[model samples]
Target chain A: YFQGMVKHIVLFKLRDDVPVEEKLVVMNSFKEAIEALPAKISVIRKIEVGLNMNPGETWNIALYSEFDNLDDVKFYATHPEHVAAGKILAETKESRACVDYEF
Target chain B: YFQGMVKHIVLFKLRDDVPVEEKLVVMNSFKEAIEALPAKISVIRKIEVGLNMNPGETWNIALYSEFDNLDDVKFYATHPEHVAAGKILAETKESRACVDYEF
Candidate 1:
């Protein structure tokens, strides 16, 4: 259960000018990069990434993660592997949004 | 575990001009209203709400929810209580972004 744990959620909206196929490639690449993080970033208790299926929504991707506490969250954020994974989105994404909270 | 479940994530960017205290009040009200939904909308398997603690992030609030499948997600979206809860954000939020996908 996620009780008393910190949940970190991020939503990304890719640039509209990018082709649909390119967007898929970028999102999938980032997903693969992030999913491989538990091994490199031990503070990450769990993580899941997904592409938005709802056609009407603006955000294209979702990143949900769990950590024991805020310290772990900070560690995961600044971890080198995580930073590299984030760079993929930073280069292609038009806007990024995030939330971190305790459940 | 959320293995086969559908996750619904929404990020909200409240109006920039709104006072910090007022934003808190609005976010809290929406959180309370949404947290009360399981009783009224059975399709909602789980729900969590949070304020973004990161100062650099643009999104102010995050809503995380779980459902059994896409059908349940659709049901939750149209349910009266869920609709009413969303109205709170719709009125105050400057931009809304969402992602729904199976995990």
Candidate 2:
């Protein structure tokens, strides 16, 4: 059995032609948007966002955060703010990749 | 033109019973070992290591580092020292997961 809870980690690769500055804009905006969700969504314990430093690697941005329970994670995904951010992320990039699981 | 190159990201989870101290030791040792490999390895720009602070998440530690090209990564992975450290990492964990690719 697990001790604490689940953590969700998501990674995204912006299109090659997209400017790095633009990607940074989207990354910071997404982080700021998600950080405000603790008030609107209840199950999230904490969130951490990171920009990938390996300029030569395939991925550009990575996001890792946790929720109290599976259902809390579900709620967080469907929350309005998350949905809005997802839309922006989708529009800014040609593709995205993710990994998530229970701890 | 872009100012930088590419990066490699690796993620791993220590066994549930693995002590936090042990994880830190492994992490620091790995970093030290990797820092010394610049001469033997080529195309590496920088490396960064991080510990997940979210107590509720699944993964324990994350590593992000940059390489000039995919072939440089191949050379680094098979180098004698990297192979040795990898063996130790394999012994310390119940499960390990990773994602690697060209930038």
Candidate 3:
């Protein structure tokens, strides 16, 4: 099995109906919510949220979070704070993709 | 603008038609090809390819590559070596997603 810190990456695509200005606001909301996780959720060792700058890319938002182990990945994922954060984008989110891998 | 090194993150989803055994081989092929890029393509400052270990996740492969700036990312994308590598997965690929962000 692969061994090392776990990198839990998530990519999100906004609904096609969302306007550019609204998407920006929604992305900023997610970015702030995700970044605040380290403080609210102790299990998150490192976390960074990046809003896609390149127009060519399909994903609108990118989240890179690191955990000490694999289990913490799920721990953080299910945390209430994380849920609250994710809920904010529920209506506008078109699709989501995740990659949880050992680095 | 977002300030920091450019992180070129790419994710791949293997076609549903691809069986687990065969998908493993295809992913390994991509891993080898992508990891070899830093050496063949000078613009890549760092690179790592991880086959998704968490079955619950949607993506099959996670690629994390760093570049000095944005232009180098486009350069690396168009490089023949990179094209040759991407083509290897053309048939087996179901979906491709990218998030290129600074920092």
Candidate number of the best DockQ:
3
Please give the CA lDDT of all the candidate structures.
0.87, 0.64, 0.86
- Return whichever of 1 and 3 wins on TM-score: 3
Which pairs of residues collide in model 1?
none
Best by lDDT: 1
lDDT of 1 by residue, A70-100 (tens): 8898889899999999998876789877888
Question: What lDDT score is found at residue B60 in candidate 3?
Answer: 94
Clashing pairs in 3: none
lDDT of 2 by residue, B7-89 (tens): 56666677778787887787677656666666655555665445555454566556566676666776777889778766656
Native A-B interface contacts kept, per candidate = 0.82, 0.00, 0.68
lDDT of 3 by residue, B64-99 (tens): 888888899989999999999998788899887788
Ranking by TM-score: 3, 1, 2
Which window of ten consecutive residues has the lowest lDDT sum in model 1 chain A? Answer: A1-10
Q: Which candidate wins on TM-score?
A: 3
Model 1: CA > 4 A from native: B1-3
Worst window of 10 by summed lDDT in candidate 2 chain A: A94-103
CAPRI quality band, candidate 2: incorrect
Write down the worst ten-residue block by lDDT for model 3 chain B.
B1-10
lDDT of 3: 0.86
